[PDB]
Amino acid sequence: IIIATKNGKVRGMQLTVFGGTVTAFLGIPYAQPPLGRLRFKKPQSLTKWSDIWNATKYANSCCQNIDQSFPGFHGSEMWNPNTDLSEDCLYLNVWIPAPKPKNATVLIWIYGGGFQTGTSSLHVYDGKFLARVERVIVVSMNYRVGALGFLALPGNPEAPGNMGLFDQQLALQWVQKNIAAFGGNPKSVTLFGESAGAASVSLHLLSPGSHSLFTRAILQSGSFNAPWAVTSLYEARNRTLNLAKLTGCSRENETEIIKCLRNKDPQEILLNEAFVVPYGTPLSVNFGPTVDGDFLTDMPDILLELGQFKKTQILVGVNKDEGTAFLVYGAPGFSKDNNSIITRKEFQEGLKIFFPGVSEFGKESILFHYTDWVDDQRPENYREALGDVVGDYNFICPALEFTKKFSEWGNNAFFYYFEHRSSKLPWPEWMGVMHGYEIEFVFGLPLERRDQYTKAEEILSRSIVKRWANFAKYGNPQETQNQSTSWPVFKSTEQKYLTLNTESTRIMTKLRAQQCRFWTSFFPKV
Ligand SMILES: *[C@@H]1O[C@H](CO[C@@H]2O[C@@H](C)[C@@H](O)[C@@H](O)[C@@H]2O)[C@@H](O[C@@H]2O[C@H](CO)[C@@H](O)[C@H](O)[C@H]2NC(C)=O)[C@H](O)[C@H]1NC(C)=O
Ligand SMILES: *[C@@H]1O[C@H](CO[C@@H]2O[C@@H](C)[C@@H](O)[C@@H](O)[C@@H]2O)[C@@H](O[C@@H]2O[C@H](CO)[C@@H](O)[C@H](O)[C@H]2NC(C)=O)[C@H](O)[C@H]1NC(C)=O
Ligand SMILES: N[C@H](Cc1c[nH]c2ccccc12)C(=O)NCCCCCCNc1c2c(nc3cc(Cl)ccc13)CCCC2
Ligand SMILES: *[C@@H]1O[C@H](CO[C@@H]2O[C@@H](C)[C@@H](O)[C@@H](O)[C@@H]2O)[C@@H](O)[C@H](O)[C@H]1NC(C)=O
Ligand SMILES: *[C@@H]1O[C@H](CO)[C@@H](O)[C@H](O)[C@H]1NC(C)=O
Ligand SMILES: *[C@@H]1O[C@H](CO)[C@@H](O)[C@H](O)[C@H]1NC(C)=O
Ligand SMILES: *[C@@H]1O[C@H](CO)[C@@H](O)[C@H](O)[C@H]1NC(C)=O
Ligand code: NA
After folding, report:
1. 425 Cα distance to chain centroid
2. For substrate, which residues are the binding ones?
3. In a mutational test of the pocket of ligand 3, which residue from 275, 435, 441 has the highest number of ligand atoms less than 8 Å from its CB?
4. Binding site residues for tacrine, as ranges?
5. How far is the CA of 462 from the centre of ligand 7 (A)?
6. Of 53, 59, 55, nearest in space to 7 by CA
7. Hey, which bits of 384-453 come out as E strands?
């Protein structure tokens, strides 16, 4: 019940799951709290302690803007932080099987949230089921988001960029030095994440500093080549100087702007983050990964294209309706509280909201590719198109492109397509299989049958959990026992992928091929 780590001892707690036991260590610090002189800088290593650290409750989340478009609605508040916000937030969690395993595969979760929001303590990232059912070890960590995590004056060590990525990387290193003490195998570590988490995992594949801190990788609705995923160095410093003036910190000694930003209080920084961009989008990443020459040594689109990444197996996939979630956060004529049948002009206006700096011709090109219907008179035509438009451009095509290019260098790749709409969901049915709603299935929440989940959902979850674990332990995401359809490796030619649902598990070919040729070849040029 007490574990001895390189920096000191840590007390955990015991949990009861499915007639068994899991040992949870919630809130182990992995770095010096980034307060004061340290705000905006890379994490600094933690100096040892002599007491017994009590890791029995989730630690503080990093400071972030909550979104308030739906106060009181669980469909949206399930994603908001469920723990005190604070700059002092560099902590991680460990769930290990009981009894203590000997050489367990380790899964390391990295949450998404547009790089502005998110926390490891969310209910739908509870690692206790994966520990219990598959006897792997699960680790999640908090990393700095928003400007306190990704503010960038390039080359300048007071605000270098990618600090949140270096937070992640320092947790990964903590697992390397320490997880053996917990009964884990540091030579068997799978990163997995979703949305910006998945884009984070993809960047860890590119970053030499993490090459040796994990084995394999799983990308859920997210990759670095997605349009939101990397902010330019043009944009980044335009953004940190607009933050400077909004807070009365514009100077000319670039480092003393930073000194000036260090005396502001967190919430002052948070209020102004939203306006350093002129035209914003529900998907807008105001402060993101940057080519800092340290974590990321070159533009990732080039590293991907020329084979400059960790060679290993990747598991990649996306959801059928990645786009809908964002339509109710800005798009006109859209509401979670009606079927949001919009018109041709509302569609048009919804493109100017999601594609704001884009030419009139650009927005006409999108409308032309997405509005030649199998039936001109279905009222929901434009509603479905704009959903598809946002999902294809922001998630599905980048993920497919990443998998093709990665697989072109000889490693096994597996692609999936999650298409199950859960029965419980608090959002209306027109929104479909939404961004982030496979996460609970990966984490085994439908296993605790309880109130929410049909037995069909319990089974799908049980299978996904097995495929994920087999991928982590063995590099091959098969379920070998219950006469399951085999999951083929994705190769650049036939582009086979697997669909996940409660009814038919089917092998299909070339997801969204016609849509994605538009996004990945034609549209980048406008
Ligand atoms: C780079 O930044 C400038 C300045 O941004 C403005 O000032 C900030 C403090 C904040 O209040 C922002 O909302 C402002 O936009 C941008 O120039 C502005 O461009 C917009 C229109 O696109 C408009 O607000 C003003 O006409 C401009 N303001 C000034 C002071 O010139 C500029 O567009 C940004 N982007 C690039 C690529 O340079
Ligand atoms: C779906 O709902 C939106 C707005 O929902 C509600 O309606 C408002 C009157 C107000 O009470 C809001 O706070 C609610 O959330 C409808 O969009 C509105 O349409 C009319 C057109 O004149 C008008 O009230 C506004 O311009 C629109 N509001 C927007 C775009 O935000 C939409 O018409 C509804 N559609 C269907 C099919 O029910
Ligand atoms: N735009 C900025 C930055 C940002 C860019 N892209 C993002 C993606 C997610 C979160 C934030 C961002 C912002 O913070 N809010 C505006 C958009 C509203 C998003 C609310 C966040 N909650 C949800 C999340 C996810 N699934 C959701 C499903 C639905 Cl139905 C509703 C909310 C969701 C999956 C990953 C975790 C977060
Ligand atoms: C650390 O925890 C020690 C033991 O706490 C035990 O577990 C918690 C969850 C409670 O149920 C408590 O009653 C138990 O005794 C404490 O004795 C010790 O003081 C704690 N140390 C610090 C620094 O908080
Ligand atoms: C765990 O497995 C690795 C190889 O995956 C091996 O080198 C190591 O010695 C093992 N440690 C144990 C069994 O404690
Ligand atoms: C002011 O700028 C110079 C470079 O022009 C820099 O070396 C110096 O450190 C800055 N001032 C302080 C107090 O850091
Ligand atoms: C396989 O099927 C049995 C029932 O025959 C079920 O109890 C078990 O959980 C299934 N295993 C997986 C990994 O799906
Ligand atoms: Na728990």
Report:
1. 21
2. 113-114
3. 435
4. 79, 435
5. 8
6. 53
7. 413-418
14 lines ligand 4 (CB under 6 A): no
* Strand arrangement of the beta sheet that strand 91-97 belongs to: 13-17, 20-29, 91-97, 137-141, 104-110, 184-194, 216-220, 314-319, 413-418, 496-500, 507-509
Structural domains in the chain, sorted by start? 1-526 (3.40.50.1820)
Asked how this structure was determined, the answer is X-ray
How far is residue 484's CA from residue 498's CA, in Å, rounded to a whole number?
12
Q: What is the resolution of this structure in A?
A: 2.7
Specify the DSSP element, H or E, that contains 194. strand 184-194
**Torsion (CA) 392, 396, 398, 403 in degrees, nearest 10:** -150
Task: Give the three-state DSSP class for 93.
Answer: strand
The Cα–Cα gap between 254 and 156 comes to 8
DSSP string covering 126-162: -THHHHHHH--EEEEE----HHHHH-B-TT-TTSBS-
Sign of the Cα torsion 38, 39, 45, 50 reads positive
d(CA 507, CA 496): 7
CA gap 365, 427 in Å, rounded: 31
C-alpha closest to that of 75 among 451, 435, 392, 479: 435
Ligand 3 binding residues, C-beta < 6 A: 67, 76, 79, 112-114, 116-118, 194-195, 228, 282-285, 325, 329, 427, 434-436
**100: phi > 0 → left, psi -120 to 50 → alpha, else beta; which?**
beta
| Positions at the binding site | 79, 113-114, 435
Task: Find, among 249, 250, 239, 243, the residue nearest to 285 by Cα.
Answer: 239
Distance 222 CA to ligand 2 centre (A): 32
